[PDB]
Amino acid sequence: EYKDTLNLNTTTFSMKGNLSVNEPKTYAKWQEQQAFKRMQARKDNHGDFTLHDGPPYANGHLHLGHALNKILKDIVVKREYFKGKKIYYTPGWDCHGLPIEQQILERLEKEKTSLENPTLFREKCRDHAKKFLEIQKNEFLQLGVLGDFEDPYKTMDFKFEASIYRALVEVAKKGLLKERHKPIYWSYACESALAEAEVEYKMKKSPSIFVAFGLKKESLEKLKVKKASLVIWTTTPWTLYANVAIALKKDAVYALTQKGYLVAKALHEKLAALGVVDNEITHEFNSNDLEYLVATNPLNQRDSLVALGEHVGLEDGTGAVHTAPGHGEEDYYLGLRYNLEVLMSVDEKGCYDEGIIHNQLLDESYLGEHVFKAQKRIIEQLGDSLLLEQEIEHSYPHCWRTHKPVIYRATTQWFILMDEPFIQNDGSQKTLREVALDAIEKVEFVPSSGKNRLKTMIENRPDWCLSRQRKWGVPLAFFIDKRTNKPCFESEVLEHVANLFEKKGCDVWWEYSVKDLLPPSYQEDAKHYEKIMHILDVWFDSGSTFKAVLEDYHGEKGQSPSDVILEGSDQHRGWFQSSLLIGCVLNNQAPFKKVITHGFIVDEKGEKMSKSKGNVVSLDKLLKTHGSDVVRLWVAFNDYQNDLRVSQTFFTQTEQHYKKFRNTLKFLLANFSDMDLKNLERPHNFSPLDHFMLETLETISAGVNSAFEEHDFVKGLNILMAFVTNELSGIYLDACKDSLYCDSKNNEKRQAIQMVLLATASKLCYFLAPILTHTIEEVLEHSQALRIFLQAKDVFDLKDISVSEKLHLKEFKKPENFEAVLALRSAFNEELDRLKKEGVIKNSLECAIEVKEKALDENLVEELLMVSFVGIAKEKLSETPAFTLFKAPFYKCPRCWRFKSELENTPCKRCEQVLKER
Ligand SMILES: C/C(=C\C(=O)OCCCCCCCCC(=O)O)C[C@@H]1OC[C@H](C[C@@H]2O[C@H]2[C@@H](C)[C@H](C)O)[C@@H](O)[C@H]1O
Numbered sequence: 001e002y003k004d005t006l007n008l009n010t011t012t013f014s015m016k017g018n019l020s021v022n023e024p025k026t027y028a029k030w031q032e033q034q035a036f037k038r039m040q041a042r043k044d045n046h047g048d049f050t051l052h053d054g055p056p057y058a059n060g061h062l063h064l065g066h067a068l069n070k071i072l073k074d075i076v077v078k079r080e081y082f083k084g085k086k087i088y089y090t091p092g093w094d095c096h097g098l099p100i101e102q103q104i105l106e107r108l109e110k111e112k113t114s115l116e117n118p119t120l121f122r123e124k125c126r127d128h129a130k131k132f133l134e135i136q137k138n139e140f141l142q143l144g145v146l147g148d149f150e151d152p153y154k155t156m157d158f159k160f161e162a163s164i165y166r167a168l169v170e171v172a173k174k175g176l177l178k179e180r181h182k183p184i185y186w187s188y189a190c191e192s193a194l195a196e197a198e199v200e201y202k203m204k205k206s207p208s209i210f211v212a213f214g215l216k217k218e219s220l221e222k223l224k225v226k227k228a229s230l231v232i233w234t235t236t237p238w239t240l241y242a243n244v245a246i247a248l249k250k251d252a253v254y255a256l257t258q259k260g261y262l263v264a265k266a267l268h269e270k271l272a273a274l275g276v277v278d279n280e281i282t283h284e285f286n287s288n289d290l291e292y293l294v295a296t297n298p299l300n301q302r303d304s305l306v307a308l309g310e311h312v313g314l315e316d317g318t319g320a321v322h323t324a325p326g327h328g329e330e331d332y333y334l335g336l337r338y339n340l341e342v343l344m345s346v347d348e349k350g351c352y353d354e355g356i357i358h359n360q361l362l363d364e365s366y367l368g369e370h371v372f373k374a375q376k377r378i379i380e381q382l383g384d385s386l387l388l389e390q391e392i393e394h395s396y397p398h399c400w401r402t403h404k405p406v407i408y409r410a411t412t413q414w415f416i417l418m419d420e421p422f423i424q425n426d427g428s429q430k431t432l433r434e435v436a437l438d439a440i441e442k443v444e445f446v447p448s449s450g451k452n453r454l455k456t457m458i459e460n461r462p463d464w465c466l467s468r469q470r471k472w473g474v475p476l477a478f479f480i481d482k483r484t485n486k487p488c489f490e491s492e493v494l495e496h497v498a499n500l501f502e503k504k505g506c507d508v509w510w511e512y513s514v515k516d517l518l519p520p521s522y523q524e525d526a527k528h529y530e531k532i533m534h535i536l537d538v539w540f541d542s543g544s545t546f547k548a549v550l551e552d553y554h555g556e557k558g559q560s561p562s563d564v565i566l567e568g569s570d571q572h573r574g575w576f577q578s579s580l581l582i583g584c585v586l587n588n589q590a591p592f593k594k595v596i597t598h599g600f601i602v603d604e605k606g607e608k609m610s611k612s613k614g615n616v617v618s619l620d621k622l623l624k625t626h627g628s629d630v631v632r633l634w635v636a637f638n639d640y641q642n643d644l645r646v647s648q649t650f651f652t653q654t655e656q657h658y659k660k661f662r663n664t665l666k667f668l669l670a671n672f673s674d675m676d677l678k679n680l681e682r683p684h685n686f687s688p689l690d691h692f693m694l695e696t697l698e699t700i701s702a703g704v705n706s707a708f709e710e711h712d713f714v715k716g717l718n719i720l721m722a723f724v725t726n727e728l729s730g731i732y733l734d735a736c737k738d739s740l741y742c743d744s745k746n747n748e749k750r751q752a753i754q755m756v757l758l759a760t761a762s763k764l765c766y767f768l769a770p771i772l773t774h775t776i777e778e779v780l781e782h783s784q785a786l787r788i789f790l791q792a793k794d795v796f797d798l799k800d801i802s803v804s805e806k807l808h809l810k811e812f813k814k815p816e817n818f819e820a821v822l823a824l825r826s827a828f829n830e831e832l833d834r835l836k837k838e839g840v841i842k843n844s845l846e847c848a849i850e851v852k853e854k855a856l857d858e859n860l861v862e863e864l865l866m867v868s869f870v871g872i873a874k875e876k877l878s879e880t881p882a883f884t885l886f887k888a889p890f891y892k893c894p895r896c897w898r899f900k901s902e903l904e905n906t907p908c909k910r911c912e913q914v915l916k917e918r
């Protein structure tokens with residue numbers, strides 16, 4: 001009957017987020033009003049923070065991994081902004097390379113067409129990247145992320161292409177860029193060399209054969225046996241044509257069987273059990289005595305030299321290794337060590353060429369045949385020399401963009417050398433491997449385990465092949481002097497080319513003549529120079545972003561080294577490594593101080609998302625289903641260092657966390673909305689319960705901040721949520737509802753409660769603003785009191801506030817100790833539950849309690865236990881060692897529902913006064 005006489009305590013801040021409607025309006029506003037530039041221009045910026053963006057490929061729409069990545073970057077950046085620092089965060093895009101060029105190739109072929117003109121082909125590639133750079137930029141902004149998205153970096157900008165080339169120039173001037181001729185990864189489907197980061201290892205079925213190479217007559221006479229054939233094991237019959245040698249383990253015993261097969265003795269038992277060779281050994285020979293004997297290749301009748309390899313393994317195979325220098329790296333060095341032929345008759349498309357006829361290595365019927373299609377017919381040609389064929393499965397290197405298996409071909413390519421000493425900037429002498437290992441020890445990794453992942457790769461990596469045979473990318477734009485057959489690294493030549501690139505882009509490398517590309521002083525000798533037309537590994541491009549973005553803009557986009565880079569843990573094999581290596585040539589240090597990694601988006605069963613599996617969840621679908629602030633809370637509230645599973649159950653839990661945060665903020669705003677703002681300019685007398693809350697607010701704030709400092713948003717959101725749920729909602733807001741709703745608006749106890757709620761809302765806003773930025777922006781939009789209190793027009797004016805100073809607290813005020821009264825509260829609530837089960841009582845306000853520890857504040861007990869009366873009464877309900885509960889000897893007040901009225905249906909003394917209010 002008196003509900004209309006209570007304090008309204010409502011706010012326009014709504015319970016329902018309606019995120020699908022309101023978030024795009026918030027983000028459109030931040031773009032229109034240039035919130036990021038306003039963040040950078042903030043007048044009281046103190047300190048600097050550079051996060052250097054790793055560039056996604058400008059191909060396709062964003063997937064959930066991009067969203068994960070940019071949200072985490074956004075939280076880290078916003079944290080530093082709200083700490084008061086000046087922010088540098090320029091997002092960028094990877095525009096070159098097969099990731100763009102392959103999509104153009106697949107379209108041309110689907111359209112049944114070709115495009116041979118180099119300038120036009122690069123134009124199609126460039127326009128494709130421009131289209132999807134726009135698409136990804138606006139998709140990034142729909143996640144609520146703030147960065148220099150209107151002035152991002154692009155590896156396709158002419159200045160950027162000049163920067164990438166100038167980095168290459170520094171490598172070449174330091175003596176680390178050299179030509180090598182050796183077998184390397186060859187992708188026949190795109191007719192290009194590859195390096196490790198462009199290769200994906202996948203299980204693949206393969207023939208597996210054991211082949212007998214008979215010793216030649218004179219070798220049998222030297223060995224003093226009638227029959228002997230070395231048995232090799234190989235999974236690549238397509239390289240048998242290129243055999244020049246059979247490599248044995250140094251100083252090892254080889255067993256000759258009765259049928260005349262020669263194998264490593266340590267492997268004879270296994271081989272006989274496989275049925276490869278017979279079981280009876282007749283003679284044992286040391287491999288040192290077999291070296292320089294000669295066998296015969298059964299496929300083509302050619303000589304094969306018996307050699308000793310370095311580190312021949314005896315765990316698989318036969319202990320005798322078919323050695324093909326044109327198709328294996330260790331084979332190649334063995335062939336050179338013995339001055340043997342390098343047979344390599346497989347062309348760029350992976351097919352046998354005329355060289356099989358010229359040297360008589362393989363029958364003419366194989367001309368033009370792809371090496372992988374030829375293998376079945378090769379195996380049949382082996383006849384009786386084939387001792388056993390099996391089919392096995394092994395992890396095999398595949399091209400990262402055509403998805404086809406690679407092969408190896410001896411070829412001349414350009415490398416960054418790992419174990420080549422070079423002159424350091426401080427004058428000393430060190431290899432790149434040594435510098436990179438030193439540099440890693442100075443980088444902070446989050447998690448720490450990332451260090452040894454990257455360190456192990458550096459310890460084991462080979463020389464870095466740089467040259468690729470595609471068209472879309474930055475050329476290795478050096479001339480070869482025909483008079484010397486060596487590259488021209490003259491500073492005048494290199495910088496002249498770099499300047500042309502900066503002004504017109506690398507197109508001119510294909511269009512201009514040699515004379516036109518040479519300085520005026522060299523054009524009389526243009527006849528002696530020839531362009532290198534290979535382009536750079538795209539991992540060199542992105543490995544150069546630190547130079548093109550941080551250094552070449554002299555701090556305007558961040559410092560080099562950056563404070564933080566943040567990408568998936570798959571970038572130890574990619575961007576972390578290439579940036580580390582180039583940083584170490586140019587600066588002899590890593591171009592980052594700290595690396596934070598995250599895992600991958602996976603499905604509900606932790607499995608990888610793929611179109612073949614039909615388990616891909618699109619970014620659009622997820623945002624539309626849940627809203628970006630929920631997707632952002634999902635990220636921060638979960639162990640993002642590992643894989644994150646998408647499932648209804650986990651998003652339901654996050655929506656429940658978001659609702660609790662949002663409902664709590666609504667209650668706070670609603671219950672200080674009527675507070676006279678003059679309270680903000682005067683101190684108050686806070687109760688012990690108020691002090692307990694402010695002292696608690698401080699304690700958990702320190703813990704949320706320490707957790708967020710170490711990027712452990714889970715630990716920090718759990719602290720924050722536990723405070724919201726337990727101390728705030730469960731204790732304080734329950735004890736306070738009566739005063740808030742039923743006391744006079746002039747009541748100073750109520751005004752002191754509102755000040756605590758205002759300080760609490762202020763801390764919630766500060767700590768959630770990096771994560772739920774839209775929502776905290778919406779909180780300030782709906783609360784004039786919060787905006788005045790925090791002196792904030794919008795979310796970007798937020799600062800960490802001193803509650804002690806804003807509420808005028810005395811410094812040496814001793815903290816509350818509520819342990820004794822909270823144990824009583826817990827024991828009373830356990831006893832009250834039992835009485836409620838029995839039906840004796842319905843709620844705590846129906847009770848009186850006499851506490852047996854008389855040293856406790858009686859009004860605090862009434863407040864925390866929500867009893868209507870502290871002391872003795874007449875009707876005993878139950879008793880414990882700690883207290884005795886009674887029925888409260890009053891009527892329920894019709895206005896406040898507390899059992900404090902002396903007459904039935906009559907307002908209590910407090911309520912009567914409030915109702916008389918003049
Ligand atoms: C979290 C990741 C993947 C994921 O989890 O993605 C899974 C997305 C879910 C659905 C899959 C989409 C289609 C599935 C299918 O059909 O196959 C890994 C991270 O990604 C973002 C960033 C990509 C930038 O380019 C990298 C730069 C730095 C370097 C120079 O290249 C980077 O941070 C990366 O490390």
Ligand SMILES: [Zn+2]
Nearest residue numbers: 893896908911
């Ligand atoms: Zn009352």
